[PDB]
Amino acid sequence: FDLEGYGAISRAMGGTSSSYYTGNAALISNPATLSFAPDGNQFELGLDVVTTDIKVHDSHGAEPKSSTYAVGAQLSYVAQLDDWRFGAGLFVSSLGTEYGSKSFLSQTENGIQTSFDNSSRLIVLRAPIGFSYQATSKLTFGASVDLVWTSLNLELLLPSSQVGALTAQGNLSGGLVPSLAGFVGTGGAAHFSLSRNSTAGGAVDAVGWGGRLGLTYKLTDNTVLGAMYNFKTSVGDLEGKATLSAISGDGAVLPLDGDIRVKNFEMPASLTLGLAHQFNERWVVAADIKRAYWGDVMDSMNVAFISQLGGIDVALPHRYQDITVASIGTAYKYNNDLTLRAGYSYAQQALDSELILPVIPAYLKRHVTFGGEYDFDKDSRINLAISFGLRERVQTLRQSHSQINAVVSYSKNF
């Protein structure tokens, strides 16, 4: 879901990654770039805090606001040995909405203000084991594999009409649907809740695996070429405790308690390629094109709620498409220890969608990165980064939202 950049310096140059040293976050990016590290053993610690700013406005002007900040982190050690760089890491990141329980999105049809809450929070934990061999002096090659652990927590309200659209498109089923239609009726609402790791398991979480591999060529003595393939993150089944709760035309509430199993939530596979010409030996420039490939694997994400009274089920086809994100970045060393970086990264999806789901914000296209490094030891470096998600006005409801992302790292060398 870090479709964009990964690393404090990769984040600082428009998410570029493939054909230059991006720190140890290249494990999550292109492990073939790790052999461009200084000698010995780089040990990195990164911190990222992300403030999001969604403003859904609706049919006849009512403001639902989400001004939440998610934070992710990073810590990794890549050790030299021969050409072989052998590192590993823990990469946590976070994303979420929290609109509260006073919005129009906390209304039934009719318009009855319920107490229910709209909110979401995902936490992925990539954790790669990776390598980087220098083959010839012109070619390096790396690969990693990550253990992954996702945790999803959700508070979602659907006005009756949306439920009806779901059964009508052949998407909803399950024996609770009859049963509880006619408690919810044409002015009611259904609600789902998935609450924090209070239960040891539960939580709604899964384990799985992801993969990576890459390369690099020095076409000039001052121009590098780079390619890497990220795999579809094969997330296991999300499982935990949920509460489906049915609300009626007057505001009555039927709380129900069962287990949800979310099948087939894929992160996408992706193929990026790029260069980094250095035409001045303190004025570097890099650029990649990434294409993220969803449009493959033609199955369906299945949300199954089972309970003592019966099951509800939602099948959402995997549909989907590419996102092509052209990104460029520069890195002028104006002096010995201080490189200064900037960039931009326009993404554009192929066949679009306008699934205005306020609890699922969509990736912003035009980001604008900035940042730089200060070596204050040459064996103890530090990097920072700031990225502006230039905002969209999407319109089905009508949304507006923007991201500011802000990173740092510390790399002490050994």
Numbering used by the authors: 4 to 399, 409 to 426
Please share excerpts from the published article on this structure.
Thus far, only the FadL OM channel family has been shown to mediate transport of hydrophobics. PpF1 has three FadL orthologs, of which TodX (Pput_2883) and CymD (Pput_2901) are located in the adjacent tod and cym/cmt operons respectively. Here we show, by using an integrated approach combining growth assays, X-ray crystallography and molecular dynamics (MD) simulations, that MAH uptake as the first step in biodegradation does occur via lateral diffusion. In the presence of TodX/CymD, robust growth is observed, providing the first direct evidence for MAH transport by FadL-type channels.
The lateral opening in TodX involves both β-strand S2 and S3, contrasting with EcFadL in which only strand S3 is involved. Plate growth assays with vapour-phase toluene showed background growth for the TodX and CymD lateral opening mutants, indicating that they are defective in toluene uptake. For TodX, background growth is already observed for the ΔS2 mutant, so the effect of the additional flattening of strand S3 in the ΔS2S3 variant cannot be assessed.
